[PDB]
Amino acid sequence: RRQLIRQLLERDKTPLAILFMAAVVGTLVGLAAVAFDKGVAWLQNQRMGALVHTADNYPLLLTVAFLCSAVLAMFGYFLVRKYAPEAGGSGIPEIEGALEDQRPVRWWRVLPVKFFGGLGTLGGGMVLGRAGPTVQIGGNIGRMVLDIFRLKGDEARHTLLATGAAAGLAAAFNAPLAGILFIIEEMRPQFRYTLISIKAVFIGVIMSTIMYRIFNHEVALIDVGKLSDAPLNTLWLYLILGIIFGIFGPIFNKWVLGMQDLLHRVHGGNITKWVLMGGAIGGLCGLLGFVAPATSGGGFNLIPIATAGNFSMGMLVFIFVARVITTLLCFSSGAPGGIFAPMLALGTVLGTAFGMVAVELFPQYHLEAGTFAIAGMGALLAASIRAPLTGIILVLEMTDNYQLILPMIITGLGATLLAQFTGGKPLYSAILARTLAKQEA
Amino acid sequence: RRRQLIRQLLERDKTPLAILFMAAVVGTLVGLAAVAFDKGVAWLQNQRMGALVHTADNYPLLLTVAFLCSAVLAMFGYFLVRKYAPEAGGSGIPEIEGALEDQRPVRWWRVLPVKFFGGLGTLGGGMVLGRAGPTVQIGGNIGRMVLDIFRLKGDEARHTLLATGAAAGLAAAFNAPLAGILFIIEEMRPQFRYTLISIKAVFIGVIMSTIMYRIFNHEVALIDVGKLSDAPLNTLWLYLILGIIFGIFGPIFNKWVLGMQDLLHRVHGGNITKWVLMGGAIGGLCGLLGFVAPATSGGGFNLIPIATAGNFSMGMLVFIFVARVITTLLCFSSGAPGGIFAPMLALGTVLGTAFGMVAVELFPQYHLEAGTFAIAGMGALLAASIRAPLTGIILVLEMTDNYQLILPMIITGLGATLLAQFTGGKPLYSAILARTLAKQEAEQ
């Protein structure tokens, strides 16, 4: 007891050196994030101009569309397989491992690998997000200054590694709160105590977000507008949607896991078969990005369009199925790039679908399908990743429809609850487990 | 420990179904309890206002029933605590924070009626105290109650249901679900070791509690500030400065609330009669001040939209601040059942607006709106004194709904916490639990 009375009076006294270093980590992760974003944009831009250069010969234009992405994909898979294999896929499981001191942070390798590697896969127009990449990059950034300035202690190692990962998500979504929440709900060691200074994570998230604001102000990633409210007697519809995501989550979770295996056979581990396959998948996305751009790319483009209800039911069913396919294909191939953001697009689409059915069945509720999209936007994040609080706060930060907080929380729970009751597991912890097991086998 | 991890990771987030169900029950009860408490405080505040109309001619007689009506209700509040549940005085958050460390008991059979009816007098009498603390402690005891009744066993169920109760309590007191859940994971839970508090279950309780509050209190917001203006990047440095100002004031305010507890303890020495009488004096003063200068008494929620809108003068802002600091310390450091959480929102809003006003005149090139500095500083005392910025920031965001000010709010909040640390300040809630834990061994 007297230990506590001594501990309480000493509470929240983070070492000033940690606080200062947190500020520099966040700043670097910020600029890094901004540069990554501007980079991906530029390559997506040139590819678009290349199709204009040949905007008459359809079979030819269908080729440079394929090749330009196929090449950039290959350059991505290659940079990973050759210099940093831990820089493939998401990057979040790896950093989550780092916090458990069960994986290494080879920043001298992963930073240029993840940055330029993702720069090719993303810039090529594959179904992957900036989320994971920037989170991993940020963690390595944090590890970098730790080494350079030679800060010692478990606290400094865990903290700077955390403020880096947090500041990374924040700069990739312009979502400060969501970044901080990710670390304390998901990223940090889930089964034991740790010395991660929250105050320091904050200092990093600010500076990172600030940097992002210096370069990307005036425009939002997702503008949905201010939608209608949700009557109390309409809330049960949100629980049902949550239950639908709740059973689909685990199923989607097996698919991403299983497809990693099936795609691993195609190359067996060989750097050449793999990279070549990467160009096949990546090249497919560049082609799909011209013949049906809704089935390829980040997916952020069709969120506002879905929410406004500008899609038909068929197009929604199409976009969903098509994106499930191209998401598994891209992420379970080992390419540098996350699944986080493309699940936002997947959730938004499924929600709008549910909302549309809801509108016709209940004209007495005066429904707007867009409200079920916003509820379901972070529902796949809740059912598959199993971090609902972060997903809910994230969507709130991006869509700014706070008057829908109750639907968003209820759908989010109905996902997480049924995800558990159907044997699903946190994807990020299921991957780190898969990786930690192949390590001791 | 690699192999335990692969085992643990695959077993992650599988909260026992019994705990998940009971979380829903706890939340619902905490909701109804909160709603009842709110409706009760309103009714008594209402009757007192009607009594002043009954004698709205004789000012000296008017100034008396204004005193007595609050003095009586205060005494009835101080009395219910001292006689039946001494741990139900003051905030209530330090005590529940103690419960999660298993260092304090949860005597729900006593505190529930004591805190409910006791605070119902102090708040309903119009003292400068909040629903926050009371509902949080009440909620925690509600949680412990169903734990005992249904005889759930295990550290996990104890800590969890005790936590979903405290969370659903803050949520129903502010109509702030996110802020309630965040409070548990940023502040409430044991800060120095591991614990088995299912977040998913805290959520289930927070939902149900907030839903219950929504059944009875829809259509109206506690704080309507409207959609203010945005904040340019070149204006951000002003928010860090405001944060630093709160940063040095927090710890100072922290000493005052602590020290005033001591100074007021001498006036009664521990005696139930001197204390209750002194409670009537303080409580009666608030009922009087509630008629002659209602801005210096009461919960304070009323003058937040007024301050933000810029409808006060700099003099009135200076008056309201000093006066409310005085009546806040007087009410909370007296041991009355009622928190300091909400009155610190009012104090923060006023100080922010004050800063905003000076900021507007000094910089017309920024095209400033003083209300943006109020919203920034609204959860800043919460950040500098309580040292839970993330909760305060999200809380204010939930109440004021001005998300386009998230950066100023975060930055001011940090400057508070950073300078609160660097000036030797301590978390108020932890500094009270320590004072209580120490006295519990001092008399041994």
A161-164 own/partner pairs: CB under 8 Å, 24+ apart: A161/A95, A161/A98, A161/A99, A161/A105, A162/A99, A162/A187, A162/A188, A162/A196, A162/A201, A163/A22, A163/A25, A163/A26, A163/A200, A163/A201, A163/A203, A163/A204, A163/A205, A164/A25, A164/A26, A164/A29, A164/A138, A164/A139, A164/A140, A164/A204
A339 marked as binding residue: yes
**What is the least distance, in Å, from the CA of A385 to any CA of chain B?**
11
Alpha-carbon span A126 to A133, nearest angstrom: 14
Q: Check residue B424 and give left, alpha or beta (phi > 0: left; psi -120 to 50: alpha).
A: left
Structure determined by: X-ray
The answer to whether residues A30 and A207 touch, using CB atoms and an 8 Å cutoff, is yes
Q: State the amino acid at position A106 in one-letter form.
A: R
CA dist., res. B320 & res. A399, Å (int): 37
Give the Cα-Cα-Cα angle B200, B100, B213 (nearest 5 degrees). Answer: 50
**Domains of chain A (ranges, CATH numbers):** 1-441 (1.10.3080.10)
Q: Which residues contact B31 (CB under 8 A, 6 or more apart)?
A: B168, B172, B208, B209, B210, B211, B212, B213
In Å, how far are A330, B176, B256 from B345, measured between CA atoms? 49, 14, 17
What CA–CA distances, in Å, run from A346 to A129, A130, A321, A340, A352? 13, 16, 9, 10, 10
Could you give the count of Cα atoms lying within 13 Å of A284 in the half-sphere of its Cβ? 14
Closest by CA to B259, choosing from B123, B435, B442, is B435
CA-to-CA separations, B93 to A184, B87, B183, B377, B432, in angstroms, rounded = 22, 11, 11, 23, 10
| Farthest-apart Cα atoms in chain A, separation | 80
3-state secondary structure of B90: strand
Q: Determine the Cα angle at A241 with ends B11 and B186, to 5°.
A: 50
Resolution for this model in angstroms, one decimal place? 3.2
Q: Would you say A171 and A182 are in contact if contact means Cβ atoms under 8 Å apart?
A: no
**Which chain A residues have a beta carbon less than 8 Å from that of B390?**
177, 180, 198, 202
* B192 assigned to a ligand binding site: no
Task: List the structure tokens of B192.
Answer: 């120095």
* Angle at CA of residue A323, ends A319 and A326, nearest 5°: 145
Q: Which residue among B15, B177, B414 places its CB closest to the CB of A203?
A: B414
Handedness of CA A250, A254, A259, A260 (dihedral sign): positive
β partners of residue B90:
B337
Please state, in angstroms and rounded to a whole number, the distance separating the CA atoms of residues B432 and B74. 23
Task: Extract the tokens encoding A79.
Answer: 């940079």
CA distance A401 to A228: 9
- What does the alpha-carbon distance between residue B263 and residue B329 come to, in Å, rounded to a whole number? 11
Look-up: residue for tokens 């639908």?
A: A244
Which residue is it, tokens 């509630």?
Answer: B290
Say how far apart CA B7 and CA A90 lie, in whole Å: 22
Sequence-distant (≥ 6) Cβ neighbours of residue B404 within 8 angstroms: B230, B231
| CB-CB contact of B323 with B296 (8 Å) | yes
Hey, which residues does B337 pair with through a beta bridge?
Answer: B90
CA distance B127 to B326: 12
Sequence-separated (6 or more) residues with CB below 8 Å from residue A68:
A46, A47, A50, A124, A286
Using the structure block, give the residue that is written with the tokens 């987030």.
Answer: B13
Among the partner-chain residues B12, B422, B427, the one whose CB lies closest to the CB of A426 is: B12
Q: B130 pairs with which residues across the strands?
A: B339
- Residue by residue, DSSP assigns A18-65 as HHHHHHHHHHHHHHHHHHHHHHHHHHHHHHHHHHHHT-S-HHHHHHHH
* Residue for token pair 């009875």: B216
Select from B186, B179, B145 the least CA-distant residue to B162: B145
Q: Which residue of A has its CA nearest to B404?
A: A400
Q: How far is A189 from chain B (nearest CA, A)?
A: 10
For residue A188, give the DSSP letter: S
CB atoms within 10 A of CB B419: 20
Amino acid at B203: F
| Cβ–Cβ < 8 Å for B378, B354 | no
Joined tokens for residue B110: 């006593």
Contact B203 A409 (CB under 8 A): yes
- Cβ neighbours of B393 in A, within 8 Å: 177
Q: How far apart are CA B186 and CA A259, in angstroms?
A: 38
State the helix-helix crossing angle for B155-174 and B17-54, rounded to 10 degrees: 30
Name A135's Cβ contacts closer than 8 Å, sequence gap at least 6. A91, A92, A95, A165, A168, A169, A172, A338
Q: How far apart are CA B210 and CA B222, in angstroms?
A: 14
Report the half-sphere exposure of B2 (CA within 13 A, side-chain side): 12
Q: Which residues pair with A129 in a beta bridge?
A: A338
Are B203 and A420 a contacting pair at CB < 8 A?
no
* CA distances, A236 to each of A232, A411, B27, B349 (Å): 8, 9, 18, 37
Place of tokens 């990786």: A435
As a whole number of angstroms, the distance between CA A19 and CA A201 comes to 9
Query: Contact, A61 vs A290, CB < 8 A?
Result: yes
